[PDB]
């Protein structure tokens, strides 16, 4: 269960890192020199942070999905592992399946 | 020694020309050559099969 939780947490952290801006790919026509290639690459690299930009009509930039999903699978795995650990360590009556409130003699 | 023989008059799929018909050829459980052709030729038996020690 520890390894399962570790893998789930690391994967969730990576997916949160990728989340945000989309991946966008620039295309250039034949006869584009290396300096123009570097300029296009820097423009694409900074385009996500930069609201606006201009390119020649002969070029093209396509915004592709980056990472679309949810945290539901990761969190489900973490909860499963944590419940397993709680049951194994302290029993499945008070920690994992908590006994809830309720007083009395 | 070679382990693998079929001596019960058993049927196996041997393909002569455009068709596969009953015949007993290699009939061994070990292979070093003609594996791709043996697969078609060495289709496990249709009928009772019993093995012996040719030791050839």
């Amino acid at each position: 269960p520890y390894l399962f939780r570790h893998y789930a947490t690391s994967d969730l952290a990576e997916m949160l890192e990728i989340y945000g801006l989309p991946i966008r790919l620039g295309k250039y026509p034949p006869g584009t020199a290396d300096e123009e290639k570097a300029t296009l690459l820097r423009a694409v690299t900074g385009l996500g942070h930069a609201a606006a930009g201009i390119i020649p009509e002969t070029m093209a930039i396509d915004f592709q999905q980056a990472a679309q999903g949810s945290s539901d699978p990761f969190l489900a795995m973490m909860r499963q592992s944590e419940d397993a650990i709680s049951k194994a360590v302290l029993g499945g009556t008070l920690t994992s399946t908590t006994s809830q409130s309720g007083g009395g003699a | 020694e070679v382990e693998g023989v079929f001596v019960r008059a058993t049927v196996e799929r041997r393909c002569r020309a455009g068709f596969c018909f009953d015949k007993e050829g290699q009939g061994f459980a070990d292979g070093v050559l003609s594996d791709e052709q043996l697969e078609a030729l060495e289709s496990d038996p249709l009928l009772k099969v019993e093995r012996c020690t040719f030791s050839g």
Binding site: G31, E36, P56 | -
Partner: protein, 137 residues
């Protein structure tokens, strides 16, 4: 000045330049420098029309392909009357096709002698980039 009188003479021989440049003497005797200069200037103006959107205008160096194109256009301009099927007209059309291909980003402007040309900053422009909270605070 992507081409000179020397380039025209070398490409088309001095006799043809004399024949198409001397308009006052029959038969021709000398090459008129003013007419050749005007033809070369017109060729350069057309080439700049084609190249203004991708490179700086006052080029500090002349690429070799640019020299060939300028020579061809200048020779085509030295003809007072130029019909459609004249081969010089066809050569001018091919050179104009090369220029259009360069303008549309299908051909690159080659080396001048050893270094690259100077492209304009048209593609460089981006807004600026606002990325506070990502500067290792």
């Amino acid at each position: 000045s992507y081409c000179t009188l020397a380039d025209l003479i070398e490409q088309y021989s001095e006799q043809k330049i004399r024949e198409v440049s001397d308009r006052v003497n029959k038969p021709a005797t000398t090459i008129d420098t003013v007419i050749v200069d005007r033809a070369i200037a017109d060729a350069d103006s057309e080439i700049d029309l084609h190249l203004h959107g991708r490179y700086q205008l006052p080029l500090a160096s002349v690429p070799t392909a640019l020299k060939r194109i300028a020579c061809g256009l200048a020779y085509a301009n030295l003809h007072i009357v130029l019909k459609e099927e004249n081969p010089v007209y066809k050569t001018a059309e091919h050179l104009r096709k090369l220029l259009s291909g360069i303008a549309n980003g299908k051909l690159s402007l080659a080396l001048d002698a050893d270094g690259k040309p100077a492209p304009v900053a048209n593609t460089v422009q981006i807004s600026e980039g606002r990325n506070d909270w990502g500067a290792d605070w």
